[PDB]
Amino acid sequence: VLLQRISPLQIDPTIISNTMSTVSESTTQTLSPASSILGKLRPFS
Amino acid sequence: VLLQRISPLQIDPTIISNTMSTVSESTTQTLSPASSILGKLRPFSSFRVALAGWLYNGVVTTVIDDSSYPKDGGSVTSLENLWDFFILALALPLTTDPCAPVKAFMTLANMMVGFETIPMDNQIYTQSRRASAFSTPHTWPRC
Amino acid sequence: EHVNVFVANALVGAFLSNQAFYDLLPLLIINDTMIGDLLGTGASLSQFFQSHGD
Amino acid sequence: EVLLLPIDHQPANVTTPTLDFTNELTNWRARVCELMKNLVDNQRYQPGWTQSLVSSMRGTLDKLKLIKSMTPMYLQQLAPVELAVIAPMLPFPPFQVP
Amino acid sequence: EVLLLPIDHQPANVTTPTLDFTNELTNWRARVCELMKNLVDNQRYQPGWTQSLVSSMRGTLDKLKLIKSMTPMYLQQLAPVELAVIAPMLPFPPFQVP
């Protein structure tokens, strides 16, 4: 906690989601590198 | 205004939309160069003004508004940002700002971070510093 | 004139890796002590050198 | 009598215009596009996009390059005149620096 | 007075930060991605994925590599300080082993 209060660093997950919203892919595809990674990251203690 | 009234030139955005309606692409695709560019252009005041500014650069220096550069700086991996670059590159040269060139340069340099790297001058005006900041001669990077 | 080996080395070394190098030039020529000169400075990377007092 | 311009002004010799790409600013659009197109076909960037998106991106860039806009032309042939014709009527006359 | 760290600490020389990838941990992310990318383009693994999935996978990996995170930087320049500044105030002082 002490750290969290003094450190200027802030974690903001939206960063990962934004860059990921521009990944190029086909919709007829079974897998989505983009999606899967987000669902694996489930965006601290 | 005076200009708008006398100039025979007329701005008609539909031009961009028409040529763009013939761009070839797949529907199963996630991104649309065609679409994105239109939504980025959102198709005037600023144009006519920029011209007027040419007459008084003695006391007034036109510059591209900060709000027009990518928030984080952009990334060559973002189609969105690629259009952002485009927009800026085409506009800068119409401003009286004597530093436009350097900004037009840095604007891309900022997106290239990590992809392509260059030798900047020092630790303050780094390759990642918002392009819009190189507003004075003393800042034009060596490279 | 006498050049500051330390700087010389970092210069080439920074330039060869595309790191900011221009702020090093003013230190290329030794002022009074090859070491003393750098002990102060807040220039370039700590990757090349940093000071701990004396 | 001197009025400076941050652009090259080449007076037009005709009174019945026609699309023209032989302008200073038209090349600028061209180059900018060509650059982008190269950034895309870059052997170490092109592998990250679906082979289809590239074709589309290219196509688009080409259409932007070859777009039939008159602005660049106007800026080189007429704009400068218009300004010169207004200047004498302004209340606050021009004040420039090279 | 010695406080050991499992990371390389290179004090920052400025007070007005800017994204920087010249960090120990930033390379680590890079390498890890590059490896994956190679595992995918491996002549005897790449044939099992639709030519499209690969492009996407690559693109993604690149975006992860070039992501604009500050953590790696912070960990190298500030974090160590913060700790050093707290240490003296803890009730139970540090107890380390190389």
- From B103's Cα to the closest Cα of chain C, the distance in A is 18
Between helices D24-40 and B79-91, what is the axis angle to 10°? 160
- Residue C30: how many CB atoms within 10 A of its CB? 17
Judge: D96–B58 Cβ closer than 8 Å, yes or no. Answer: yes
- From C36's Cα to the closest Cα of chain B, the distance in A is 22
What 3-state DSSP class applies to B11?
coil
A34, HSE (Cβ side, Cα atoms, 13 Å)? 21
Q: What is the DSSP letter of D16?
A: S
SS (H, E, C) chain E: CCCCCCCCCCCCCCCCCCCCCCCHHHHHHHHHHHHHHHHHCCCCCHHHCCHHHHHHHHHHHHHHHCCCCCHHHHHHHCHHHHHHHHHHHCCCCCCCCC
Sign of CA dihedral B119, B121, B124, B128: negative
Q: What is the DSSP letter of B28?
A: T
Neighbours of chain B (3+ CB pairs under 8 A): A, C, D, E
Who contacts E9 (Cβ-Cβ below 8 Å, separation ≥6)? E76, E77, E80
Q: Report the alpha-carbon distance of residue D56 to residue D33 in Å, rounded.
A: 14
DSSP string, B59-124: T------GGGS-SS---TT-HHHHHHHHHHHHHGGGS--TTHHHHHHHHHHHHHTTTS----SSSS
Contact with chain E for residue B27, Cβ under 8 A: no
Who contacts D97 (Cβ-Cβ below 8 Å, separation ≥6)? B57, B58
What 3-state DSSP class applies to C29?
strand
